[PDB]
From Swiss-Prot:
UniProt entry keywords in alphabetical sequence: Calcium, Calcium channel, Calcium transport, Cell membrane, Disease variant, Disulfide bond, Epilepsy, Glycoprotein, Intellectual disability, Ion channel, Ion transport, Membrane, Metal-binding, Phosphoprotein, Signal, Transmembrane, Transmembrane helix, Transport, Voltage-gated channel
Protein's job: The alpha-2/delta subunit of voltage-dependent calcium channels regulates calcium current density and activation/inactivation kinetics of the calcium channel. Plays an important role in excitation-contraction coupling.
Comment field (misc): Binds gabapentin, an antiepileptic drug.
Classification via PROSITE patterns: VWFA (PS50234)
Keyword Aminoacyl-tRNA synthetase: no
The protein, known as: Voltage-dependent calcium channel subunit alpha-2/delta-1
UniProt-listed CDD domains: PDC2_HK_sensor, vWA_VGCC_like
Organism name: Homo sapiens
Domain notes: The MIDAS-like motif in the VWFA domain binds divalent metal cations and is required to promote trafficking of the alpha-1 (CACNA1) subunit to the plasma membrane by an integrin-like switch.
Superkingdom classification of source: Eukaryota
Protein localization: Membrane; Cell membrane
Predominant localisation class: membrane
Length: 955
């Protein structure tokens, strides 16, 4: 065992060698002084985060107010044109002409109902929607389980033509509108841009179960937030088919509860108990709904019924005010079959002011008495539903929600307020959208008062979709550092907008149409400062906060010790709150002063893929430079069209943004001046395998043009993990290649090395680019084993990944996590606390399904980093019945640590492994997360318990 000073100087000499090689070949200084050499070619401008947040909040509120105005127009016209409708029973004499969405494109003259003539439209391909779109009329969706020629459906299809016309008007005053739709309460759905239904028109194994009245936006706009409590009657008499139907019905009832709704499930048989681990009303989000569904699926029937001990439990759990709730619409859902017990005194004791509804469901095919079941609904403002078989399950849930909207109708114009739903995946696939709803009231008898029989029910709900990518375009991101970004938030803390929000459903457990509800604390790493910021944003305040944050790298494999500054404002007129993350060095950006029309041309000439031998292999970020350019995943295609458009650019002045092209051309020119005046004068270094420079404008020219085929970084520089990592870290960062990845690999590509330029203009810190070297593995291993005369030696970077070693069998598994190699040293070296680790959760990850294609689960990813700042570490590894010695030295001015451990093939301490990998897991235990739930602000105004409501419709 060499002494500490010997291997200390050893590490010092390797770090001197590596730093000198990287600094020379990379040419940080040459790119720097090129950047300061042309201060007359640009201007440095500030990123006033306060004004940026205010501007983006104003823009988003303007967009949402535009959609609100569209909704108001549509709802007013719907009410007016249904008020003046004449009921009919004969449509043979007067056909209704409409386009049915699930019509085959074949010119079939025989696909018409008696009372309806079908339109055959001319479908154009549209860029906004990505489907066939006809602007000449609205399309109609009628569920399969609903006949499309009955009297109700035919009358609705008759009076919705004015809706069609107002659809046209709305789209004519605002060409950016997406799907705008009337969700009828008869089952129909009439959206304006006529497009064929998704895949379910006529396709085997593609059945169309879509029903507009179950959709989250319809569920949301049809009533006010609930406080359910599903009483399931698991007694003896419900065994067999009845219990199957009850558990399916409870699942389908839970599938109609939003995140503003609170629900628990109880079950009684001579004794009432909770079916799950929850002891009170919990929020009805995806995780809690799954827990309740599992508990209901795991339920068995036994014992004698007792309707008094069950309703006592229900009324007691609805009297709990210690927990978070939505103090509104208290309900009891009784899932029984029948009995001769009315329990008058329980109701008279607990529900005497009749503050709580009771919806009773007589599930099953049986001959038990159904009188008390129908009476509990009458004396408690409820309604009585029957579920004789699966297939009747879907319709009755929509129907209690039909009942709950009576108090909302009676409040004439105080109940017509626009509400936006959680981020969900559109049916007519558009990606991620939020829908703004407004309910439509039946106003036939009004100011000419008639019997007004069913004037307490809504006609439907009008929705208009806002694309999430449409919100993303109101928050311009390219004037910020690749580490700076915007994000918005719900009142529940979910993110309207965030870089880590992907168009995938939220995972809920282990694999074996829910909304994309991703909390703010789960889209990032969670400190306590971030909990304070989240609570401040939910309340709708404004403020600033500068602090130190662990910023996880994009590749989800490292953690860096960042330096952030959150500024937030509420978006006026809505429930959303916008914030802007901004690094401390990102307060200034370079504004390209390209107005010569010739300098930009001599910059542009560098970009055709015919000069890729004096200038490096060029990739361009597929940004929206001009709208006539379509971004392409195949990058060289986009480069070709970019060159083509640059060839004739001058007349396209208003067609596109000048700033992006000016900056990208300026950066291309600077990169060319670097690659010729410093890289083309040398042409060859033994150690290097590739020299690259990546710039925020989009230029990522890699020099040799040979490793450019081995280059696997994203063309858009703002999504380059190493580029974002190297800006926060003001030092050299080595990115260990991927292990066991099918492709160019590591030997014939090298290992990535990078440092970020740190130029100063007017005494301001701004970092416009990164340079780097793809050091070859052999040219390092020879130099590492060259000095061995002056075996177990390993090099580790941040995250504990083996960059390279000496045993020559570890170098076979290069880049692989060191804990997978010898986990005992990994655990011990963590125990010294040189490597801290953070374990977090990824709710939006694809997942291989096991046993009890790929589903989505919650994966539990961990990342390691330098816990302490100390440089020298020594100790003894107390292996089981043996002893091992190590010394650790962190190379100065890099992210590396050298471990001098001398022990191979000793007694087996390889009991387990430290597998730093995206491990499949269950999420946090929900039974423990509902007792300290995250802060959350419920909706303010809700409508229940009106005195004009006519309860004599128990059905
Ligand atoms: C292992 O291989 C060679 C060993 O010679 C390393 O390169 C040498 O690194 C030392 C570090 O201190 C330099 O002095 C050697 O010469 C230098 O060359 C540069 C070239 O620009 C000059 O500017 C310097 O002034 C100095 O003369 C250098 N020699 C060569 C031929 O590169 C090599 O970096 C190392 N392998 C790895 C992967 O780092
Ligand atoms: C909105 O409310 C109005 C009234 O509040 C509804 O119109 C009424 O609908 C009923 C059907 O439920 C009509 O009764 C029917 O009349 C025909 C012909 O007279 C008869 O053959 C049927 O057996 C049935 O009795 C009623 O005439 C009609 N109008 C009025 C003034 O009551 C309307 O249906 C509601 N909106 C929707 C979308 O349902
Ligand atoms: C994620 O990684 C961070 C790395 O900073 C972890 O934060 C650190 O956690 C340790 C363990 O709790 C904290 O040490 C504790 O400090 C308190 C206060 O001095 C002391 O009383 C305890 O005995 C313990 O030593 C450490 O302070 C904390 N770092 C900071 C900056 O606060 C974090 O725990 C990891 N996990 C998660 C889920 O964040
Ligand atoms: C929102 O309204 C408040 C007070 O009405 C105002 O101070 C703030 O500047 C407004 N924000 C925006 C973005 O208009
Ligand atoms: C809102 O609509 C007006 C005209 O109807 C339009 O000028 C404006 O650009 C729209 N706002 C947004 C954010 O698109
Ligand atoms: C209802 O049907 C009649 C007869 O076909 C038609 O004249 C009327 O315009 C229809 N209503 C609407 C709102 O189009
Ligand atoms: C839940 O399922 C397990 C496994 O089938 C079973 O042992 C347990 O009894 C079930 N829970 C209840 C409350 O019956
Ligand atoms: C709520 O808290 C009070 C006092 O902390 C306690 O007496 C009561 O038992 C708790 N539970 C309910 C359901 O009120
Ligand atoms: C940002 O970094 C500097 C030095 O790199 C440090 O002094 C400062 O405290 C950091 N910011 C915060 C908010 O701690
Ligand atoms: C990309 O586009 C270019 C230009 O048409 C073509 O030569 C190349 O084969 C394409 N590559 C891929 C992978 O599509
Ligand atoms: C280190 O290991 C010891 C025993 O092996 C354990 O008690 C301790 O919790 C571990 N972690 C730290 C930080 O000491
Ligand atoms: Ca019974």
């Amino acid at each position: 065992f060499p002494s500490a000073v010997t291997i200390k100087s050893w590490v010092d000499k390797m770090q001197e060698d590596l730093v000198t090689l990287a600094k020379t070949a990379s040419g940080v200084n040459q790119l720097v002084d090129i950047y300061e050499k042309y201060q007359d070619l640009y201007t440095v401008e500030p990123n006033n985060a306060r004004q940026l947040v205010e501007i983006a909040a104003r823009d988003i509120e303007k967009l949402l107010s535009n959609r609100s105005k569209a909704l108001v127009r549509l709802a007013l016209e719907a009410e007016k044109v249904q008020a003046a409708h004449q009921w009919r029973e004969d449509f043979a004499s007067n056909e209704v002409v409409y386009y049915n969405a699930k019509d085959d494109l074949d010119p079939e003259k025989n696909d018409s109902e008696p009372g309806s003539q079908r339109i055959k439209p001319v479908f154009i391909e549209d860029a906004n929607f990505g489907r066939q779109i006809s602007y000449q009329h609205a399309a109609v969706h009628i569920p399969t389980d609903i006949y499309e020629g009955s009297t109700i459906v035919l009358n609705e299809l008759n009076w919705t033509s004015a809706l069609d016309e107002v659809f046209k008007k709305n789209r004519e005053e605002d060409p950016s509108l997406l799907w705008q739709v009337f969700g009828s309460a008869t089952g129909l759905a009439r959206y304006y841009p006529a497009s064929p239904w998704v895949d379910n028109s006529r396709t085997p194994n593609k059945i169309d179960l879509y029903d507009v009245r179950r959709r989250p936006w319809y569920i949301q706009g049809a009533a006010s937030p609930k406080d359910m409590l599903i009483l399931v009657d698991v007694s003896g008499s419900v065994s067999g088919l009845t219990l199957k139907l009850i558990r399916t019905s409870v699942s389908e009832m839970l599938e109609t509860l939003s995140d503003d709704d609170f629900v628990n499930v109880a079950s009684f048989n001579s004794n009432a108990q909770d079916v799950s681990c929850f002891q009170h009303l919990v929020q009805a989000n995806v995780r809690n709904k799954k827990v309740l569904k599992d508990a209901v699926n795991n339920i068995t029937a036994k014992g004698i019924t007792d309707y008094k001990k069950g309703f006592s439990f229900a009324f007691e759990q609805l009297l709990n005010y210690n927990v978070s709730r939505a103090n509104c619409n208290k309900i009891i859902m009784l899932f029984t079959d029948g009995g001769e017990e009315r329990a008058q005194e329980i109701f008279n004791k607990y529900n005497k002011d009749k503050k709580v509804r009771v919806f009773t469901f007589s599930v099953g095919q049986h001959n038990y008495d159904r009188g008390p079941i129908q009476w509990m609904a009458c004396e408690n403002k409820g309604y009585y539903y029957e579920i004789p078989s699966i297939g009747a399950i879907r319709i009755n849930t929509q129907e209690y929600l039909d009942v709950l909207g009576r108090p909302m109708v009676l409040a004439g114009d105080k109940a017509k307020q626009v509400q936006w739903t959680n981020v969900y995946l559109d049916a007519l696939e558009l990606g991620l959208v939020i829908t703004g709803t407004l309910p439509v009231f039946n106003i036939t008898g009004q100011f000419e008062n008639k019997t007004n029989l069913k004037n307490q029910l809504i006609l439907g709900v009008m929705g208009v979709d806002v694309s999430l990518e449409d919100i993303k375009r109101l928050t311009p991101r390219f004037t910020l550092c690749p580490n700076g970004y915007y994000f918005a938030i719900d009142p529940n803390g979910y993110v309207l907008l965030h870089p880590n929000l992907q168009p995938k459903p939220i995972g809920v457990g282990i694999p074996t149409q829910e909304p994309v509800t991703l909390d703010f604390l789960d889209a990032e790493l969670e400190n306590d400062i971030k909990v304070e910021i989240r609570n401040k944003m939910i309340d709708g305040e404004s403020g600033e906060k500068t602090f130190r944050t662990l910023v996880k790298s994009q590749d989800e494999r490292y953690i860096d010790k960042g330096n952030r500054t959150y500024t937030w404002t509420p978006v006026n007129g809505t429930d959303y709150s916008l914030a802007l993350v901004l690094p401390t060095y990102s307060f200034y950006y370079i504004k390209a002063k390209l107005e010569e029309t010739i300098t930009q041309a001599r910059y542009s000439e560098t970009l055709k893929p015919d000069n890729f031998e004096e200038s490096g292999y060029t990739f361009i970020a597929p940004r929206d430079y001009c709208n006539d350019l379509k971004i392409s995943d195949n990058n060289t295609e986009f480069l070709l069209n970019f060159n083509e458009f640059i060839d004739r650019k001058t007349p396209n002045n208003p067609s596109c943004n000048a700033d992006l092209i000016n900056r990208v051309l300026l950066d291309a020119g600077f990169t060319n001046e670097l690659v010729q005046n410093y890289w083309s004068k040398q042409k060859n270094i033994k150690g290097v395998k590739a020299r690259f420079v990546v710039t925020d404008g989009g230029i990522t020219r890699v020099y040799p043009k040979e490793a450019g085929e081995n280059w696997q970084e994203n063309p858009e520089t703002y999504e380059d993990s190493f580029y974002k990592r190297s800006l926060d870290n003001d030092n050299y960062v080595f990115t260990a290649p991927y292990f066991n990845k099918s492709g160019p690999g590591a030997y014939e590509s090298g290992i990535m090395v990078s440092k970020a330029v740190e130029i100063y203009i007017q005494g301001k810190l701004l970092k416009p680019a990164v340079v780097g070297i793809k050091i070859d593995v052999n040219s390092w291993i020879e130099n590492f084993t060259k000095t061995s005369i002056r075996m177990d030696c390993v090099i580790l970077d941040d995250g504990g990944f083996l960059l390279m070693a000496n045993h020559d069998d570890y170098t076979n598994q290069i880049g692989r996590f060191f804990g997978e190699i010898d986990p005992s040293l990994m655990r011990h070296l963590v125990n010294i606390s040189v490597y801290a680790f953070n374990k977090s959760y990824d709710y939006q990850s694809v997942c291989e399904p096991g046993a009890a294609s790929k589903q989505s689960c919650i994966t539990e990813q961990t990342q390691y980093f330098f816990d302490n700042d100390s440089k020298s570490f020594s100790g003894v590894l107390d292996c089981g019945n043996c002893s091992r010695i190590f010394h650790g030295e962190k190379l100065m001015n890099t992210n590396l640590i050298f471990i001098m451990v001398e022990s191979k093939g000793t007694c087996p301490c390889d009991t387990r492994l430290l597998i730093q990998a995206e491990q499949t897991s269950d999420g946090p235990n929900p039974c423990d997360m509902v007792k300290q739930p995250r802060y959350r602000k419920g909706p303010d105004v809700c409508f229940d318990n009106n005195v004009l409501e006519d309860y004599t419709d128990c059905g």
